[PDB]
Design a protein around this ligand. Sequence first.
Ligand SMILES: [Ca+2]
Ligand SMILES: [Ca+2]
Ligand SMILES: [Ca+2]
Ligand SMILES: [Ca+2]
Length: 449
Amino acid sequence: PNGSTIDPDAATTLTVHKCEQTGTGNEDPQAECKPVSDVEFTITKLNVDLTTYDGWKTLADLKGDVVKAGALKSTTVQKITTGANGLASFTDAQTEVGAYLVSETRTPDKVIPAEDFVVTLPMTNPQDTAKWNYNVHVYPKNTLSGVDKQVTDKPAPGSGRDITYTITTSIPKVDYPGGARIKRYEVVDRLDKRIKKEALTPVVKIVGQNEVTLAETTDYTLITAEGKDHNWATIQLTEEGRRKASEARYNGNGETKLQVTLNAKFDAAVNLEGDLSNTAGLIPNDSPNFTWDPNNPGTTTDIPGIPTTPVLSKYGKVILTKTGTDDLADKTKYNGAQFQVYECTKTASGATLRDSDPSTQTVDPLTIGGEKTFTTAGQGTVEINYLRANDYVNGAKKDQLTDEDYYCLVETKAPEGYNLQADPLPFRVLAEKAEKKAATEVTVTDIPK
Ligand SMILES: [Ca+2]
Ligand SMILES: [Ca+2]
Ligand SMILES: [Ca+2]
Ligand SMILES: [Ca+2]
């Protein structure tokens, strides 16, 4: 057959590449693609004859409207489910010369669906416009740009202080002016049981170009529940909240998102040693595979819906040992020394203490586990429980550290027979110790009188 015109009896294939993150028709060997298995694609042949100019003209007239293409659907349908390599490889047995509507028709809960799209077999090869390409490769786009969770714990160096979580989730684009509405939209947070689930004081916004704040009851309701190994908080948009979201996204773009702020609170003496992990998930539609019931998590442990990566806060124990240049074997002589703790900047002359509460003129020490003063006892020791790692803050490792990234002990009362210190004493709590619940061991040496 002639190479320049369409061969009605040509063998064809259609290969859909399903990737976690996201069109020439040619295979693109990298092409960064983390393949996604177990996703079903359905192709439906359209009622256009691509062996005729009129068939191509019908497609052109759609001006890329995929919903209008749906009006051309035949009853000729084929399906394939991706394997480990994320490919849905429709064969020559499954495809013929013509146009197809391609839709992702089964999607594991955690996976973002592809957008529907139309493909032709063959395509004119843009890399060689003298060729008809009968073996088409397509890399579909995600319908949602992402879901993300952040933590702000820079304000919480001492354990038990407030931590803020911010969850930001894509909103599906639906045909708002046509009457289409998101039918279900829930943001679920899997809460560590150390957080007070009854005191989250949520704030919900639609962010992007021009942000708005949504109203509880009117636009959403917060539903919390006890769980097995965690507790649970769901922000569930109401009919009006869903309407606002549907509209905002339609008039906006992919970066028009819901933003949920949760204000996590603790008992002051909370045992935060180690990692405090938080994860959220998005349920973006009313598909029956999302069986989450915000009021009945039952024994669920995995986050429902499309998950964020977890975010961590890391708090460590400090064990302070008090001694002296006299090195007495009777360690009880080093009891009764008192200390307070600050964030500080190490300097050539010691350290500059940072005021823990800038609202007042007095330079205040940190409140750590509800306490400000730590007194040696026993064998001249005291535990300071617990301090957030200096090198892990706001949900990320601080790759580079500076002299600003310190805590300081200040000796506020010397043990009997000893001097106070000349300077504050800088130290760090490192994530490598805190995340393993390993103590940070600091020795303070006193000068005898
Ligand atoms: Ca065929
Ligand atoms: Ca499910
Ligand atoms: Ca000094
Ligand atoms: Ca102050």
